[PDB]
Point group: D2
Chain length 480, copies 4
Amino acid sequence: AALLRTDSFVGGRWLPAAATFPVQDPASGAALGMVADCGVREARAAVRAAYEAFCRWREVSAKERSSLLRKWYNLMIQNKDDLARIITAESGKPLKEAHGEILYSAFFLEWFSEEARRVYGDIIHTPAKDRRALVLKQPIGVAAVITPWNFPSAMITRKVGAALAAGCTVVVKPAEDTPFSALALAELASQAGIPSGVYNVIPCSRKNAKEVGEAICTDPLVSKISFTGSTTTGKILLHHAANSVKRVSMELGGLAPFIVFDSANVDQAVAGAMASKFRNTGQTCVCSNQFLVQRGIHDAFVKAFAEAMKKNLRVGNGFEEGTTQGPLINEKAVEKVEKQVNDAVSKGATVVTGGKRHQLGKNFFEPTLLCNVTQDMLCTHEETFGPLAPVIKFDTEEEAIAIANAADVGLAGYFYSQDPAQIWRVAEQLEVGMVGVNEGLISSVECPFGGVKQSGLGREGSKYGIDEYLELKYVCYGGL
Amino acid sequence: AALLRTDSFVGGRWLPAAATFPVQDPASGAALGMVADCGVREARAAVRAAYEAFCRWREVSAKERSSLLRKWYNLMIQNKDDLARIITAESGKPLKEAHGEILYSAFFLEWFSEEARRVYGDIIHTPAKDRRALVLKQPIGVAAVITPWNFPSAMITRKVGAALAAGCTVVVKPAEDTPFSALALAELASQAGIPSGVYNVIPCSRKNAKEVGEAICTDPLVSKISFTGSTTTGKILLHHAANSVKRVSMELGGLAPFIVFDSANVDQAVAGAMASKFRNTGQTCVCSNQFLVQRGIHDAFVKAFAEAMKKNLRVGNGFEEGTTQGPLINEKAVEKVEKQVNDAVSKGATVVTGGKRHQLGKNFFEPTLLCNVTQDMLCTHEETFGPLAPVIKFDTEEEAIAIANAADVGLAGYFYSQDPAQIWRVAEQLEVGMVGVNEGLISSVECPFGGVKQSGLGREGSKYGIDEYLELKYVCYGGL
Amino acid sequence: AALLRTDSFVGGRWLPAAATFPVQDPASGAALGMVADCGVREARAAVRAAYEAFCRWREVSAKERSSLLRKWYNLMIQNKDDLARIITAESGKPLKEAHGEILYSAFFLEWFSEEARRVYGDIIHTPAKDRRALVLKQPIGVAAVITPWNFPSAMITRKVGAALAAGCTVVVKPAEDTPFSALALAELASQAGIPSGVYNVIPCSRKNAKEVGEAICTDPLVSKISFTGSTTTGKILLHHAANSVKRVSMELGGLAPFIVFDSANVDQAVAGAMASKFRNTGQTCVCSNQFLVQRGIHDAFVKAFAEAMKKNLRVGNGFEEGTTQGPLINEKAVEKVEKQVNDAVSKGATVVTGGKRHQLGKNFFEPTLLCNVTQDMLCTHEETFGPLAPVIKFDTEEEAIAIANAADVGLAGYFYSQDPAQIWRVAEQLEVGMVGVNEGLISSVECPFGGVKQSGLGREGSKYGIDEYLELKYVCYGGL
Amino acid sequence: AALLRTDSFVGGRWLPAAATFPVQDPASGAALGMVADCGVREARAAVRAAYEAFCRWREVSAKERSSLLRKWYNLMIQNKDDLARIITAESGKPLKEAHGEILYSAFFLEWFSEEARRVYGDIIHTPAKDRRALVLKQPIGVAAVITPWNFPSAMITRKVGAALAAGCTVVVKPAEDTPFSALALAELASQAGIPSGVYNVIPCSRKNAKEVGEAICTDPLVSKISFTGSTTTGKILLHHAANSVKRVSMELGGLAPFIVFDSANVDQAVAGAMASKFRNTGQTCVCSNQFLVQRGIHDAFVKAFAEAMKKNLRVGNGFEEGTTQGPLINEKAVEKVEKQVNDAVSKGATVVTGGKRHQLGKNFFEPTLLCNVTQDMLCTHEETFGPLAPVIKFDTEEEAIAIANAADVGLAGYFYSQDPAQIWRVAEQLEVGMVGVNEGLISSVECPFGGVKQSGLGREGSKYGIDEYLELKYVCYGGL
């Protein structure tokens, strides 16, 4: 339809840039389009548009902003199949997974639509009969939103929905690998009636990424930064934000431990492992799962896991019926996966199921399962995504928790057990922002997502998401 | 008593450092003591002590931590007069004001003592009959606390109280000008039974300040930074925090507009102006008030203000009966005040009441009131504290709001009016974190304090303070 | 359309009863229809249908119940004009007011639609490391809903919306004077997809009212009672509920003080008085406003009030262009109004604007304004609704508050003032559940409505409404 | 000390009545004292004192009321041993249990002391830019508090603490069997500084009970009723409250199912059963536990249970070392226990451990355990307290839940299991207000206690307790 766009979206208008960059299907290599490659000039212009829109948008009633967000949601649902095809075309993930992301993405707009009318202030008792204490909550202002390629749609709506519900406006800088989903949302934002300048998208290529990222994370007109991506880029943006003391919410990619204890239901643990690592229809995080299995259940688990990989995983093009494993995003991605596999094996690891490039070549790699993997074998690959599952054996619960709690790891965590007391211990002791108990797919728009320690700042979704875009104002009404 | 200390407090022990630095009474110049001048080595040691204490403290029940915080509070009240003398001795502020700060300081320990047992998690509904969603709140870990000299006691307790109530431990780096109040709190913390390593204080001189500040804001064992001070230092610490993605709450010094509208009650506005600028017994912020008065009430206000300054302000030593204006903290402080006065006059300003050094000399300056001051006359003095009040005239409410909203200013705000509708407009439009309506002294431990934009990050006190030291954990209990 | 119904609605089906009762247009006297006159037998059957539906409905996900409630809302908006005509036809209120009620009615379904997904449980800290404390919130079960004729639509949705959002089912017993609005909602409930038995309506005539009221407020299958009406009936139902300890929320008709202080803006106070007493497009309560005016502004207020009545009030049929005053509901209503007027005059009162039956006769009465009215003149008329406004003069604020606070009066309150301090005093001292400051139309679905003392129990609308249909369950998860 | 009192406490004074009634030690029969037997006259006088105190108390700052409640708490702790002896002397429960109750009782005063400063109002967004919406919470007024003999101290503080924290005053009508604990609290209330009329106690004998109960539950000056006792009395008070529409919170005695599933840890289930039924050091409810055991674990459970009864239960005087089972409260109590035992046996039941009066005679009965008990065997004994444990066997979880959910039963529930999924099902499906998972002693002042259906109204303790004594006030600040 008119959903596939190549121009940037600023101030309610489609604007081309001086340059453009190619976007190709990660599965077939086919050209998808020449997208505007916005530079610093265009980024400042977008910020200004967002800033001027803010002054008006903050004035719109919560009920009206709520209504607009819902219309945007309804439009997403009405075009959900085409929106899913766009995700599959640019990210390469299988259609089913794409359909899954779109639902979550739409559900975020709907969820915050409902949150918009529930920004509550407080009335507090103070000793002095002289005054009354009021606490108001007001929108921060303009927010720079920067998202990864992994979930080209859901990562934007969970942020932008909260921002708009609070009364803020945004300037979105989507991933060069997947800009279409961001622009498709723009088309629907205008169809929904979102006022000009409230939702802006400035696509840009790798070479403009740094410059643009700095421009929007330093502009005096921007008061908030929301980023989801690599630790390297995240720390760079955090420094930009430091110079003007901007509010920041962040989520950095990393490892996610998946622990299987002796009392776990094996088939369930395997199913969870499967859905979690190979057929993720959610959007929990830019986290790659790695397995810790207890000696007792180890062998049985590894065997059943491999058997499920052979029975359920079908590598191929994401648009084709029955495809379960799409391509990696690019050649660099394949290389990183190869690295981890080879270095692991060269250290004692054992491959259980094909650990090499797929016969289809290009960006496809074989679903790989390795055992006899050791703790130290994960170094320098903390951010290596791909169909690679290293299994590390452990003897005791204490041992597993210590391994999992290796600092720098604090996003999502998962574990299978049938011991009530163990379930509470591990869930509370695991140093992460999210824990899945006997479940591998834990995405939910009504729950808080984010990381602890160096995995991030702030939370998204749930009743807490909107707070990232709000400022408290204490009002001492005296003279009484 | 045994309240005046010169050694650092680490791991429940009094430890001297290789070097020391002098602390002198800002009023008399008399030597108060040679305080340990902690260096990087001692800072890391303190962090380790705080880190190891954390692992145990987080395990203590909320009721027990609550009880300990209350005992600490009771001890403060029991020694309130001596604690007040220490503040006056090192900060120079008049005893009355010192007594006022101590109460607030103690009240912060008491308030968070009560908050400790109220850290509530959530149970959220999710569509899947397959799981249940739980949200737990857990302490961040070790927090680096850095405070200014202005309120040597209250600035520490409001932070440390929240930190400890949440289950975190802290390493306090007090201002070189006023380290005694921080160490006096340490003595009482041990008397109260606060476990070793939970509350640590590492005093240090100007020359060690940078090094130490960096050490604790970069240490891998520190997960949270809480700072209150200059914008320059704040931005430097924010950069240190950026490298390891630490959580940060911050409050940076600046200007605070005090607006007087035509319908205001003059005597009240003046009284408020008085208490606000010259006799501040509170601790709201490291903000210096400046006045915006409407043409209609202007003359009458300026005249009554000056008359009150002449009738109520008595410059002298803070320990002496009737003293209302103590000394500035140091010679540099006097110089900055002189600067602002002279540059203002050299641009058209008119002095209404003595604007020069006081006849007592040393660090004393005459309470000064200037009118015919212009907007631009405040440049490069946004952080100049002292008994200096420039009055700027304005014609319309819109005008006053625009002047006040000069970005970079977002801490506290005040205004006097008797128009119900105007009161709501100004309170909501003023871009600050705190607003006082027909009241100049708005401090309250049960209300949220902090700034917007570049004036800070986060809030302290109230029901929101403890959140700065907490992490949310989403737990998806599946397998159901 | 197919919106006008005459049969009861039970278990998703339209069921006629053994008998029927006539419903006539209060303005013209024309027959509107023969409505089913449900008896005890049919009431028990409806309860059973609601009870069996409950067991299934409680199991439906909050998101699904939320979605269904929204569809019901959308259907209301889509048919809003016809729904408004029905209200005007049966209650006689002018179309504009009817349109106003429908919006509020629809907005209640929408508001609770959003509340449905926000029923949050808690996780509480307890000293024992042995357990964890959880608090779940679950629906009460079947609720008997009994509403008055005044607002035949909004009174039902505000209750039923909350009930359904919580997961409860309901049996509605509408007012004999206005049953159509309740049945029109039924038609739309089925079009929306509300499952059979979730929303039941059992119309009945005056003679069956008692019997039926008792049947549903005593049935073992009913766990909650929600009533809005006269004090007499309310106390009778409260006794029925007492025998089986049912949960009850209630709102009883009464007087609402409208106080005008000397500093009030006269035209505004008058406008507020007008909208409040004669052109009420809201649905705040089954409360009749009476005026208390301060001596200083008295004369000016009375004069301007009467002048506005003569300029804006047009008695006539509610469907006709420009009608501002519809008929009273029935002959008894007219009689009660006549009573109050005559007894007031026979005690010193002075009529300012025609205080007799209108020349159109039938159920129309002339908008009446009386002054020189005294406090005691309101006895035995606390529940007399109609276009009658008695003005009582007072000298002091203390005096006005004492008059207003005559126990038995605790629903809504209103007052006009321009004194900030007075505004806080009166708002807090007025013994009512709702207060309007310089505003006569305070209806809002996002705010809590209800009374204090004998004016009621519980609140409706806002974030608190859903609690009336919920039960807390403390779960001590031990064995840890 | 001066803790044992015989006069009523009204308006801060000790007042004797025209008559008196004897209080005897349930274990020894010894006379404890002649307590004032207040009549209707004295009850009205107490209400008036509470009413006049209210007008002043509501005006006291939350911090001051908080401080007073804490002093009252500290005094309880300081006299905890004597307070425990009083409970044992009048209720007969073993000292250990008495010490346990006192702690809970004191903890309630402390908990609400902290809640007092946290009564928060709201600020809500409404579409009209014309107004702002505020929600204030204010104290209801005077509350009539009526408590049972079971927990003569904790039942009063949990209610009175919440009442006073909210700003209400109270009139306490203690159980004739145990009035001393109520008067001991009075002595400490005065020592603490609680203002006269805030806490009143009007003891009365069985014959005056009805009259007095009616007087305080009908008095126009009373706005709230809080009762904990038999269903019969509760329904009688509910009717009294109905006539003036008073707010009511209630808890009625009944049965509490204790379910043991096949996967439960036997020794733990038995220990839980023991503590739950024979050595209850808590105060959860006036609920008597009865057991449902699954066929699989049945025999093993019954055998281990009986063995524990023989090893740990020592019938004797509560003041004597090692006593584990005190006397029943009176002869009627013994008779009711005998009834249940005999009728159960005469229907097939089998006694496992002595089911007759103890050899000590008087009010002592032998700890009894019966198996082969059937569902119907519990009729007409739903409120029979005593050392009697009937075990009912069941085959399936569905079966156990159906048995437990026999309406009229909705207070506390308990069950032992090691199946994570089963734990969630049973906890949510059990129709009670409180559930214990693998734990028999679930008392906690920070958690909500109360019943569902006919077991009660409202909750006590936790963050929800104070709401029972509050009224919401919606304030529409318009004219903007």
